[PDB]
Structures are given as structure tokens and as C-alpha cells.
Amino acid sequence: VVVVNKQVLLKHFIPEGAPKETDMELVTTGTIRLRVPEGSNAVLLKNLYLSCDPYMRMRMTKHEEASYVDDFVPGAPITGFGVGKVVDSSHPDFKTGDYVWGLIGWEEYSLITKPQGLFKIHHTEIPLSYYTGILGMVGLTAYVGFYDICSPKKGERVFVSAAAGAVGQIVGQFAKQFGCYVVGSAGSDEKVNLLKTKFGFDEAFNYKKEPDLTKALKRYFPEGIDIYFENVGGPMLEAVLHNMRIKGRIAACGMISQYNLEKPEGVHNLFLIVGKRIRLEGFLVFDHYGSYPEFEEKVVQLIKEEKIKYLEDIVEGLENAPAALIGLFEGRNVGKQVVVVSREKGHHHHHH
Amino acid sequence: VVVVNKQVLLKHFIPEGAPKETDMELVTTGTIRLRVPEGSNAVLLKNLYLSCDPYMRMRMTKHEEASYVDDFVPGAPITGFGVGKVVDSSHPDFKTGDYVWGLIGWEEYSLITKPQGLFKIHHTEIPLSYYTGILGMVGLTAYVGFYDICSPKKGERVFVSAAAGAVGQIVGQFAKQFGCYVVGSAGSDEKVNLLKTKFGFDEAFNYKKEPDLTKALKRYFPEGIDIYFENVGGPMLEAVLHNMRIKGRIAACGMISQYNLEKPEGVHNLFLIVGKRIRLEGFLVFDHYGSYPEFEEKVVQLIKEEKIKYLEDIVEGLENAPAALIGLFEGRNVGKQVVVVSREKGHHHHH
Numbered sequence: 246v247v248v249v250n251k252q253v254l255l256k257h258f259i260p261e262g263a264p265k266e267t268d269m270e271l272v273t274t275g276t277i278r279l280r281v282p283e284g285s286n287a288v289l290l291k292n293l294y295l296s297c298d299p300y301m302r303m304r305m306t307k308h309e310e311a312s313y314v315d316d317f318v319p320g321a322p323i324t325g326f327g328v329g330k331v332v333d334s335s336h337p338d339f340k341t342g343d344y345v346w347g348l349i350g351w352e353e354y355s356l357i358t359k360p361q362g363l364f365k366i367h368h369t370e371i372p373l374s375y376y377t378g379i380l381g382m383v384g385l386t387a388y389v390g391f392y393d394i395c396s397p398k399k400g401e402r403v404f405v406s407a408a409a410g411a412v413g414q415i416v417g418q419f420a421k422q423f424g425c426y427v428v429g430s431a432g433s434d435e436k437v438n439l440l441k442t443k444f445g446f447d448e449a450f451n452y453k454k455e456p457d458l459t460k461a462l463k464r465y466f467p468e469g470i471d472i473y474f475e476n477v478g479g480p481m482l483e484a485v486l487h488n489m490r491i492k493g494r495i496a497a498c499g500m501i502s503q504y505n506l507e508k509p510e511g512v513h514n515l516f517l518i519v520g521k522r523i524r525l526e527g528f529l530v531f532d533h534y535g536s537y538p539e540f541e542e543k544v545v546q547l548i549k550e551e552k553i554k555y556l557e558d559i560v561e562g563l564e565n566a567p568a569a570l571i572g573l574f575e576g577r578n579v580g581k582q583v584v585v586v587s588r589e590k591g592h593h594h595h596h597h
Numbered sequence: 598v599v600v601v602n603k604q605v606l607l608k609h610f611i612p613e614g615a616p617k618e619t620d621m622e623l624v625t626t627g628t629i630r631l632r633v634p635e636g637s638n639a640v641l642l643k644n645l646y647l648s649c650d651p652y653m654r655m656r657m658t659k660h661e662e663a664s665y666v667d668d669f670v671p672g673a674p675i676t677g678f679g680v681g682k683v684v685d686s687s688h689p690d691f692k693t694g695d696y697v698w699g700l701i702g703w704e705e706y707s708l709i710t711k712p713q714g715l716f717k718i719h720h721t722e723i724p725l726s727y728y729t730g731i732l733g734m735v736g737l738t739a740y741v742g743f744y745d746i747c748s749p750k751k752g753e754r755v756f757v758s759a760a761a762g763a764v765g766q767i768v769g770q771f772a773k774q775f776g777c778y779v780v781g782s783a784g785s786d787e788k789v790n791l792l793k794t795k796f797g798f799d800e801a802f803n804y805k806k807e808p809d810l811t812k813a814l815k816r817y818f819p820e821g822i823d824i825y826f827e828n829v830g831g832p833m834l835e836a837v838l839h840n841m842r843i844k845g846r847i848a849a850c851g852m853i854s855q856y857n858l859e860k861p862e863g864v865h866n867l868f869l870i871v872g873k874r875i876r877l878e879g880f881l882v883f884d885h886y887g888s889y890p891e892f893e894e895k896v897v898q899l900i901k902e903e904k905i906k907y908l909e910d911i912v913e914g915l916e917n918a919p920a921a922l923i924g925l926f927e928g929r930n931v932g933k934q935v936v937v938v939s940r941e942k943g944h945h946h947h948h
């Protein structure tokens with residue numbers, strides 16, 4: 246059997262700036278064999294779900310000095326985190342029928358020649374799409390960023406930006422259940438309302454309807470901020486610095502306001518870091534897979550007990566992957582942006 | 598027994614911008630009685646040596662919200678670290694003839710009503726002026742900053758801004774002795790040459806003669822920088838971040854480039870901290886006086902063994918303190934800036 250294998254390719258490198266749909270092209274003509282090559286040590290996946298993640302945009306720009314991940318290649322499939330089902334395997338740790346998450350192609354079938362970076366899914370009763378976010382890379386990021394990087398203590402005053410996002414909605418709930426006071430910023434009233442009801446944040450505000458971020462942070466933090474879970478950067482970062490307490494911490498998870506800027510914004514008040522003895526620390530979840538067992542143990546139990554809430558934004562079909570990715574930098578995604586490529590056989594779960 | 602007590606007063610608060618000599622006045626008519634008051638709990642000092650330190654500038658500006666340290670007060674003496682001799686004492690832990698360091702008045706005699714701020718000097722064989730710098734607040738800064746905040750490991754690559762300055766000349770040596778590759782930036786060819794001969798830095802450069810700081814750092818760090826001891830801020834930091842290695846650390850000691858500017862400059866590449874997993878951390882020596890005893894011991898041994906070098910810029914006389922202080926922000930000080938207010942009798946040789 247040879248079968249159809251649609252793909253989304255990167256049409257070309259793009260300059261600093263925003264990505265556009267037309268930087269990527271769907272190809273419907275491709276095909277694939279349903280067995281791994283003889284002599285291989287490899288896994289063929291049927292791909293089921295794809296994650297759209299903000300870090301993916303930077304990969305659409307050529308870098309001369311190797312960054313932490315390899316750039317995409319013009320004319321090759323876009324790649325990113327997703328979930329697949331093993332169709333065939335010449336690697337002993339993977340059997341036909343296993344479900345796995347890892348870096349896979351923006352396509353219907355991916356032949357993975359380095360299986361070692363696939364994670365076998367051990368909990369298939371949990372909806373599989375969760376392994377693209379909360380139980381995948383995104384959730385581990387929340388966990389490492391909050392519990393390790395932030396050094397939290399009960400009672401501390403915590404601010405999360407992009408707080409209705411995939412990372413931030415998780416962070417908020419961890420902080421809350423840790424016994425912290427928690428405030429989030431988000432880009433719409435719908436998000437704000439989700440933060441205050443569904444996610445149990447103490448307060449939230451719509452950053453786009455604030456003419457002054459410093460004063461706004463001052464409203465919700467009359468004694469200032471202990472901990473900032475930084476997802477955005479820009480002027481929001483300056484506003485936090487101004488409102489930060491002595492021995493405050495900032496876990497620099499990301500800086501999404503800067504990713505599509507020809508010209509990144511200046512941060513002006515870093516000297517506050519001296520007199521306030523602030524630690525500003527970046528981290529990359531790719532260094533922390535060693536933590537996964539402790540994390541998955543904690544998060545699977547929370548999910549199975551309904552003591553954490555999670556919101557996915559689902560888009561149906563490979564074809565809609567590119568726009569969904571672009572949507573992230575406009576804040577179109579409401580929750581964690583997933584793309585269904587093909588739903589696994591015998592699903593029977595309802596939705597609205 | 599009343600005597601003359603000359604003082605250097607803050608004339609007035611100053612706005613955003615650069616301080617100058619004339620923001621201070623020397624007054625010569627005042628006098629003081631050489632005993633502490635009965636029932637007092639105090640220590641009367643004859644002040645010997647005074648430190649000029651960069652943080653002093655910020656104290657000349659009014660702050661409606663409280664910085665780490667009180668603003669100076671117009672009409673009242675300038676204060677700062679120094680070294681003093683106890684003339685009279687109504688506080689148990691201090692006796693007549695003892696030597697101490699701590700915050701004292703810019704004047705000839707200071708009656709200290711908060712004696713718990715003072716530290717007795719236990720090595721009087723070392724020149725007492727050392728306790729305004731290498732053995733005082735300045736040395737402890739270097740030691741906390743490097744040994745604790747920078748988390749150093751044998752064989753890492755270290756860059757120091759204001760490297761010929763007091764803090765930075767100590768940092769560089771601590772680092773070289775820790776087995777690190779060390780480079781420093783300074784604002785003169787003379788300072789650059791001191792960093793390489795006297796202070797054992799591996800390389801150094803005149804920031805003022807580099808049109809591209811990013812490229813300059815790349816010349817000296819072909820595989821990037823592990824540790825940046827940050828005394829300067831601004832475009833230099835930006836340049837550092839561009840050249841910093843995976844899991845780099847920046848100990849934010851201070852950002853002197855920013856202290857006399859109406860508009861502080863913007864850092865544009867802070868996002869690199871995520872992708873390179875950089876820790877940037879401010880510290881204040883004020884929080885770390887618990888480390889003093891062990892630090893003192895360590896640096897005393899280095900001095901005894903001649904395993905560390907130290908250069909002081911010495912000015913003679915209180916009247917010369919104001920210029921001395923201003924010089925700091927122009928980089929006129931060559932070494933740790935000291936003012937001798939009065940020498941203790943019985944003495945080392947200088948040139």
C-alpha cells in the first residue's frame with residue numbers, strides 16, 4: 246500500500262516581520278509507503294494532532310549562527326510538536342499501535358529516523374490532543390518555569406502575562422494552588438472573564454484597554470509584585486520592573502511581543518534590578534525533560550481528578566494549520582492552539 | 598576640651614543629571630566637645646579615612662519613596678564609609694583607641710548614636726585605609742558578587758566592566774585565581790595597561806576607542822562569555838548579551854553609565870536571555886554582612902601572602918573630598934578613591 250501524504254511546506258525564508266499564510270504552501274500530491282525502510286531503526290507515524298507554538302515563527306528566518314533549534318528549510322515540511330500513532334517500527338522501544346508525542350512533520354505521515362526523542366504516551370484515556378499542550382512541552386514549561394525558576398512561597402504576589410494562553414493558564418492554576426495571590430493580563434474581555442471564572446485567577450485585566458501598564462499593575466498590586474511569569478516582554482516588562490518587590494523574580498519564559506518586530510523595543514529601567522535585588526532568569530524546556538516523570542505524575546492526577554482546568558482551541562484539518570499558527574501572534578487562539586490532522590479510530594467524545 | 602570640626606555639607610538636592618563640586622560646601626567655623634554625652638549610648642570618632650563610592654551620587658537626589666538608603670539632607674554633613682578612631686565611648690562593644698569602619702560623617706569627628714552599624718578592625722598591621730575599600734564595603738561586594746552571585750566554575754570566561762575600578766579590579770583577580778579567563782573594559786589606555794600588567798587580567802580594552810562594543814567583545818571572546826560582572830549597564834550590556842554563552846550569568850552590581858542621565862538607555866536584546874537560558878541578577882552588599890568575617894580572613898591571607906594586588910588613589914585633606922567624589926563619575930580616579938582626613942600617628946611608605 247502507498248497512500249496519500251499531504252504536507253505543509255515552508256515556501257521560503259522570511260525576514261524579520263510577521264509571518265503570512267503564503268509563507269507556507271499545502272501540497273496534496275505526495276505519497277508514502279506504509280512500512281519503514283528495511284535496515285532502518287525508525288518509526289513511521291500517522292499524525293493525529295499538531296501544536297501551534299510561538300517559537301515556531303523564529304524558525305522561519307535563516308540564522309547564520311546556530312540557534313537552540315535548527316531553522317526550517319524551504320521546500321521541506323514545517324515541523325513542530327504533535328501526537329502520532331505508530332504504524333510501523335524497526336525500533337524495539339516502539340510497537341505498532343503505540344501513541345507518541347514529539348517533534349513531527351506538518352503532514353499525514355512522518356518517518357522518524359531518530360525515535361529516541363519520541364515520548365510514549367502511557368495514558369490513552371486522557372484525550373490524546375492533551376499531549377500537544379498540557380501533558381506535552383507546554384505543560385512541562387509551566388511546571389519548570391513556576392516550580393523551579395520562580396522559587397515560589399505561599400502568599401507571594403504573582404503576575405502572569407499572556408495569562409489565558411497555554412502556558413499561562415497552567416501557571417496561574419499552579420500558583421493559585423500553591424497558595425499565591427495571582428493576577429493575569431490578556432488581550433480580550435472574553436479571556437479576562439475566563440481567567441476570573443474558569444481558571445480561578447484572583448484578578449485579571451485586558452492589557453489593550455489600559456493606557457498605562459504601570460498604574461494598572463499598581464491597581465492590582467498595592468504592595469507590588471513578587472513573581473512575574475514573563476511570556477510577553479516589551480513595555481509590560483518595564484511596567485512590572487517598576488512594580489516589583491525586593492527579592493522579586495522574573496522567569497523569562499518568552500517575549501512574544503518582540504517575535505515579529507523588525508526593531509525590538511528598548512527596556513529602560515533594568516537598573517531597578519540592582520536596588521531591588523531581582524533575579525531575571527531565562528529557561529528552555531528542552532533542557533528539562535529529565536523532570537517529565539515527576540511532572541506527568543503530578544499533572545495526570547490533577548486532570549483525572551478535575552483539579553486543573555484546561556482550554557483547547559481546536560482547528561479541524563491539516564489545511565488550516567498555517568492560519569492557526571499566524572493567529573497566535575494576533576491572539577486569535579482562545580486557549581491552547583491545536584490542529585486536528587486525523588482523529589484516532591473509535592474516538593467517541595462529544596463537544597460543542 | 599572643645600576642638601575645631603570642619604564639615605562637608607550637602608548644599609542642596611540635585612535633579613536628574615550630573616552632580617558637581619559646587620553641590621557641596623566646606624564649613625570651618627563649627628566645633629565639637631571630645632567626650633560623648635553622659636547617659637548616651639554612643640561612640641565618638643576621630644575620622645581618619647573616607648571612601649568615595651559611586652552609590653553616593655543617588656543620595657544627593659530627593660526620593661519621595663525610600664531607596665535602600667536615606668537621601669542626604671541639605672545643610673547636614675555628607676556621609677559615607679570610612680575609617681575612624683574611637684576617642685570616647687559609652688557603648689560596651691567599643692573602647693578608646695579602637696579602630697572601626699562603617700558609615701561616618703564627612704567631617705573631622707563624628708558622634709555615632711547607632712554604634713551597631715560600625716565594625717571593629719582586627720588587623721591593625723594592614724594599612725587602615727584598606728578598610729575603606731578592599732577590606733571594607735568594596736571588597737565584600739566583589740566577594741559576594743563573584744563567589745556567590747556569579748556561580749563560577751574553573752575555566753569559565755569572565756568579562757568585567759569598569760574593570761580598573763575598585764570592585765572590578767578585585768573581581769578580576771578573584772576570577773583569575775579561580776582558574777578563569779578574564780577580560781576587562783576601562784575608559785583609558787593607562788587603566789587598560791594596569792589591568793594587564795599589575796592586575797593579571799588576560800586582556801583588556803578602552804571602551805571609548807571602540808566604535809562597536811559587540812565586535813570588540815567578540816575579538817576577546819571568540820566562543821562567547823560565561824560570566825559578566827556588570828558595573829556599567831546600557832549598550833555595553835546589550836553587547837554582552839549578544840556575546841553571552843548558554844547558561845551565562847550576569848551579576849548586576851551596578852549600572853554606572855545610567856546614574857547621571859535624564860533618560861536611561863534602552864536594552865533591546867533581552868529576549869536572548871530565554872534562548873540562552875541566562876540568569877541576570879541584582880545584589881546589594883547591604884544584605885550580606887554575615888559573610889564579612891570569612892571574607893576578611895580570606896583577603897587578609899591574600900595580602901599577607903602577596904597573592905592579591907590593590908591600587909588606591911589617595912587625596913590628602915577633607916577640603917579635597919568633593920572633587921574627589923566628582924572625579925569618580927568622570928573616571929579620574931585611578932584605583933580605589935580615598936580621602937585622608939587625618940592620619941593616625943605612628944607609621945608605611947608611599948611614593
Ligand SMILES: NC(=O)c1ccc[n+]([C@@H]2O[C@H](COP(=O)([O-])OP(=O)(O)OC[C@H]3O[C@@H](n4cnc5c(N)ncnc54)[C@H](OP(=O)(O)O)[C@@H]3O)[C@@H](O)[C@H]2O)c1
Pocket residue numbers: 298299300382383386407408409410411412413430431432433436476477497498499500501502503528529530531573574575576577578580581582871
Ligand atoms: N522557554 C520555553 O521553553 C518556552 C516553551 C513554550 C512556550 N514559551 C513561550 O511562552 C509564551 C506562551 O506560549 P503559549 O504556547 O502559552 O502561547 P499562547 O499564550 O497559547 O498564545 C500566544 C498568545 O500571545 C499573546 N500575544 C501575542 N502577541 C502579543 C503581543 N504583541 N503583546 C502581548 N501579548 C501577545 C496572545 O494572547 P493575548 O490575547 O492575551 O494577546 C496570544 O493568544 C511565548 O512567549 C512562548 O514563546 C517558551
Ligand SMILES: NC(=O)c1ccc[n+]([C@@H]2O[C@H](COP(=O)([O-])OP(=O)(O)OC[C@H]3O[C@@H](n4cnc5c(N)ncnc54)[C@H](OP(=O)(O)O)[C@@H]3O)[C@@H](O)[C@H]2O)c1
Pocket residue numbers: 519649650651652734735738759760761762763764765782783784785788828829849850851852853854855880881882883925926927928929930932933934
Ligand atoms: N550592588 C552593590 O552592593 C554595590 C556595592 C558597591 C559598588 N557597586 C557598584 O559597582 C560599580 C563599581 O564601583 P567602585 O567602587 O569599584 O567604583 P570605581 O570603579 O572605583 O570608580 C567608578 C568608575 O566607573 C567608571 N565609569 C564612570 N562613568 C562611566 C560610564 N558612563 N560608562 C562606563 N564606565 C564609567 C570609571 O572607570 P573607567 O575608566 O573604567 O571608565 C570610574 O573609574 C558601580 O556601578 C557601583 O555603583 C555596587
